[model samples]
Target: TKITSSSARGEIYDASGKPLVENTLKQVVSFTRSNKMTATDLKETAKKLLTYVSISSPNLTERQLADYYLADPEIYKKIVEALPSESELYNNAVDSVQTSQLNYTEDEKKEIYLFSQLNAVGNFATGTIATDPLNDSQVAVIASISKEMPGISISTSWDRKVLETSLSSIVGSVSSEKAGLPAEEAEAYLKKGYSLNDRVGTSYLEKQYEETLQGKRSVKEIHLDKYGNMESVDTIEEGSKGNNIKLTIDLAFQDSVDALLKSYFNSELENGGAKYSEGVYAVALNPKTGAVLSMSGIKHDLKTGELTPDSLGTVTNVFVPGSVVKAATISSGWENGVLSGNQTLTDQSIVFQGSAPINSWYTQAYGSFPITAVQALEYSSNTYMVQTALGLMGQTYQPNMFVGTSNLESAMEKLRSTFGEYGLGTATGIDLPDESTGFVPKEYSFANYITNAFGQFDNYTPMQLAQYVATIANNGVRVAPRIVEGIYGNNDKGGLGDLIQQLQPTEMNKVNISDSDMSILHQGFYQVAHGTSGLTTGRAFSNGALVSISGKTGTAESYVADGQQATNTNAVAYAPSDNPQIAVAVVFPHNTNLTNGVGPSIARDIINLYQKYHPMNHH
Candidate 1:
């Protein structure tokens, strides 16, 4: 039985029901293999046809076009010789590619260009036109030349359009039968009744949602002749389109963050950046619901030496968090009863023998004035964090007390264990695939342990930091970050259909500290952005933006080159501190100069742009 027609693959959409990936049916200009000819003859015919249609090669000259084949010399020669000569169809050829370019849509430009290049080769429909059901004029031209060009015809085909490059890492790609399946997923897919020839999602969300996005396979009714000879077939049920997968990420917002990161990388070269300042990453998500709004990872391209946008690091890469972990350190102190919300600690420079004296980012002493938990965060006091860790471990804030305790392991565990409770040392349970739970240091000396307390020893991905900050923003509930919003149908009313499957916000774990103690952290982060405490650290963010935010800034030393170190400047903030909605995390890893507040300033710009368009949507 002969199968007749097929339908288009299902499309993917975004949060607002706007299509993110779609396909267009276009005309395929190809030649049919009707005869055998010499390669040189075929090459000449192909070249003549190419120039005849205005299909100019950007890289290759007209003579170069005649040498296009690399098959068995005999095979390629025969193939080329079989093509029609200019003497046969020269008069019927349409002249100007310029006129043809004006009549097509933007999407068709590249395809049409490829179409003409392929047609230049006269062997069986060798060129392309890119779409089907050609425009009236286009069809008229192709029709007029039909008698002159032998074995050339127009046919319908599908072209995939990737509207947004920002989401490629998570969006992934699909594989057709010709491409075959990935060895890892092939057997499982075959067991599920997927045809070996079928196009399946190979990676990322494309693979994760393959079952949902893959439309129902169409079936046909076979018509057998009475003599058992093959006859014809008809479609039984034309297969329906696949269910659409909707994401919480907004493309427009993702693009903005992408641009900002790219610009920063460029500015680093001109404005001067940290030594070995390899790359940077940023993430933004709804603290209340854990839905990722926009997550971007832009890193250095070792090959091109350019900063390009990639998605893996936001959830997979790890780094030293620096002082960004201070809020959680305070929360751990509250849980251990070593420090209370109202408890204040003297925040002055501390002295340890081999270590450099730890002090505030500000050189001018604000005094050994007692700083409350909130104030400690505002001032980013290393002493407060070191002291809090010491207190959690049952020691006083006396660094010179002479080998305080060999039970240092237990004390570090207490602090690190507390970090785990706030979504550290674990996956954020994001909906995306291939997420790294991150590394927590098990090997630590007193020196390293003290640094860990202030976020200088462990490694964390931008996604993990976003989760940590989201935990603080949600007032201690560590909601697992998610990119998926829901699964929907291409409904009848031109909007989202009944929610076929919905993802509810999931709470991974709650720190369960007193609301009053939490308020201490709340005030500290608030002051860091808007108070006198923030006047120095986050003052760069005060650029006339009406939106108010609370945040923490950090700069830690990391190795950029072998035996060479640079600073990693980072920040975490939440908007409308009174009613936290979205939390943002930004890290410019491996900087030469560690003092600029540009990192924190970006946190402000992100919120500003977010507000300019999205605003705070309250219930």
Candidate 2:
């Protein structure tokens, strides 16, 4: 005879070996079924087992109770005598019996619960008799009555316990033992040797690393003599626990970012600026290695004024990025050969025949000044990007000029494709499941195309924006952001063990731009923080002493409920601008006022906070 033993799942840890997810083992009573046992034999065994132990009845379906009632020989014979020969008619007899008031007694309920477990397993397969953990007294009693209760034994089961962390929501979930295999993927899992009632990862990172986290079953062989007495037992295979996974972000740094986000966002809420808001989100990534440093978000309920920590919203939620993506627009121009390195353009209100005037935030007071590409980013000139979009159509911007449809299609495609190269309007290839890739309009118009240049038309998640900035900071090489750093083997003490495998950074793609053109973007982002211009968009980082910060600020115009105007205050940045380390993106959506710089402040604090942990020499 062959017997199997189950091992507990592997644990999950943070980058610094802090516990994130662990397991707790509990003793359980289980039943192994035999093929030779008849239904009457199972009923007799169930009654005898009930005498030795007690188990609360689980929720039994009416159909299940009807079948259990008919398990009695007298009741079955009487029902079969009145039913037709057809199998379909016998089902109707059982259905009719289910509607009858056959109130089950307490002992009968316990017997039915035990029988349910006994009948659930296949030949030689095990099923849990009690859903609850077994008491020590019950365990001793069951051991004493082992000879009387055939096919019943004591075993251990495990529960996945998660620690209280900011990332708990994104760490994912596991299915319960009673829930078993998810119905949709049961067949696929069964093919991989998973039992019907096996616990498994059900979502997010937990599901993404299911196979690595699942334990290998131990197999043993039992030998019996001619008299059916147990002779000897031999161990065949000693199964091991699943491999442990460690995330890329350190728990301390992650929590720091979480606190920073809450502080800034709660100020907005306290000021009544975030009363009509959706939420605030931020994501930070290692520019050189694409490893996620920190990701956090706070979801706001407008009706009840509730603020809930929503870590996964950084990837799942989308908002208009505004001028934070102006760097990509400059790259689009450089890619199309419509604009040269540091080319100068007039920043003013753009007017076309039969269309409303498109103006920059500073256009009114600054009034029609020629600015280079670097200064264009320093000032976040919408008119400059609009002119680049015009050049995509093979046209120069002229006041009251009639925009034609001849090159509108190609212009939209070129802009979007260029943005996609920067990890915008496309997948970021994060290791999590069900990541939203932001929204793109199926239909395009000239007006929409122009707005798309300065990131007003399309929308993206904070994660995508972080990747976009990280790509620029990496000198155009786009690497996929990763959460998990490596997988580890369990130590002798069951703590975060030795490293088994390190997850390398995956380079998704590189932007198509020359070195000089790329530097122009780098310089422009730098000038936004350190430039001596009044119109510099990201001047919030100018005072940071921890490291030299460079970034772009955004204020996209949006509408909340009832056509009420709102602004999505956003920003993207990286520290030690010369040799970038961390790239950060912050998004505060549906702000009541347009002058809020909370996003840039949050990004700056994140960069400063990161420098505290992983200090960098400001060169």
Candidate 3:
């Protein structure tokens, strides 16, 4: 016979070693069955065990109650004595009683529940009798009953104690011993030497790092006689706590971003512009190393007007990013050889036969103007983006030009492929589980292709936007955003101990633009932040205190559930524009009106907060 003891799961910490998830021990009452033990013996033991403890709501069934009734020697004698002449009808009589309904008192039901658990355990294997943690009095009574009732004893179990923080939701959850292994993964867990009742991570980061967080089980060998009575025991191996993991984000930075988003979003709600809004999301990353600095979201209930924290929404929720993706559009133009070396385009009203007119946001107000590709980005010209899409199709925009469908698929593919290189409309490859890749259009059209240039056709998550801008900030190097910074060993107190290994940055791809071509993008982004033009798009950062902010602003036209027009305001930026560090993405979806500054405001404040944590001496 052999028995196993489980150890505590590993803890979670932030980049600065602050605890996020830790374990606390709880008293559990368990039962071990011997090979020699019979159903009658189990029943008798369950009856006696009921005296020391109480099960508030026992899960009882008729079959279990019937089995418990037959376990009594007196009931068996009475059944046999009642058989008149059928000597081989013993099973039939018992079957009749087993199938028939019978009443059981509360105490009897509790005994039956205990008996069911005790009977279900294999010979010499332990099973939990009381799934809930035992109270102090129950623990004392059970501890003293070791010799009085074999196979019944108190054991120690561990549970996760999550600290209250902005990262709480993303820290994830663990299955309890009562819930056991998830049913879909039960067999796989059992094949890994895990008992059916073993705890496991069920979601998010906890699920992503299960192998690192799950502790090793202690093994022991027992010598027993033919009757299955334990004679001696020998230790095989001692168990240890699982390895810890430290995240890339600190608690302070995460909370600060959470506060920023909440405050800005609440202001929109107060202004009545966010009456039909779903919520707001923001994410920050270390562009050079792909370390996730902070990710926060707030979910708004339109009917109740309630706002709650939804940090994981940053990775799962998708929005139609507007002009924030203009840089990628221009990159596509450069890559497809349609435009090169800061080529100038006329930002005028684009009119295609059988299609609606496409114009820049300022064209209706300021009329047509000639601008280079950098100036197009600075002014966020939709006409330039549409022309780039047309240029991909080997067509120059003329007055009421007839757009053909012959090269539509190829043009759209080239544009999307370039955008994917920047981590848009594709997986961000985050460390967490179940990330949304956003929605990409299946059917191809000339209109959709052109609209995709200005980031209106497909949807992308906030994390993907952050990764996209980070790719630009890192000078075309695309790295996967990672939550965990390193795996650590457990200390004597079972907390964060030694740094075992530091996780390296994983570069997914690199943009194909040359250094000179990339410089145009840098300059364009700078002009967006500080351009003296009256039509500059992202002038909100013109007077920022700490560092030079450079980025793009997106104001996508969207519709609410009732078909009412709405706007999706978005922004992507990086600080110390010349020498970038932190990259950020902010999305405010389904606003009641256009021209909302909440997105840019949140992005700017998040950068300032990041500067507060790691100050730059000079720009």
Give the best candidate by TM-score.
Answer: 3
lDDT of 3 by residue, 327-354 (tens): 8988998899999799988878888777
Per-residue lDDT of candidate 2, residues 1-619 (tens digit)? 7766656788788888888886887776666655556578788878877666656746776666776777776877787777554465766665575455678886677778777777887875666765555679877777555556555666667778788988788788888866778989778987988766677888998888887887787555654556553333344675578889999989888898888878887788788788888889989999889999989889988889888889899889888889899888888888889888789988888998977888988898877889999998988888998899889889997799987788888789988999999999899999987789998987877778888888888989889999999999999999999999999998887777888999999999989899888898889888888888888777787775578888998888766888678788899999788799889998988888676568888888888898888987655
Task: Name the TM-score of candidate 3.
Answer: 0.86
Per-residue lDDT, model 1, residue 222, is 41
Cα TM-score per model: 0.71, 0.84, 0.86
- Which sections of candidate 2 miss by over 4 Å? 1-7, 34-36, 39-125, 131-150, 190-195, 218-239
Question: Mind giving the per-residue lDDT tens digits that candidate 1 earns over 598-618?
Answer: 688777778777878687846
Compared with the true structure, the alpha-carbon lDDT of candidate 2 equals 0.82
Rate residue 61 of model 1 by lDDT: 36
Instruction: Return the TM-score for candidate 1, rounded to 2 decimals.
Output: 0.71
Deviation of model 1 at 13, angstroms: 1.9
Candidate 1 vs 3: which has more lDDT = 3
Q: What's the true lDDT of residue 523 in model 3?
A: 94
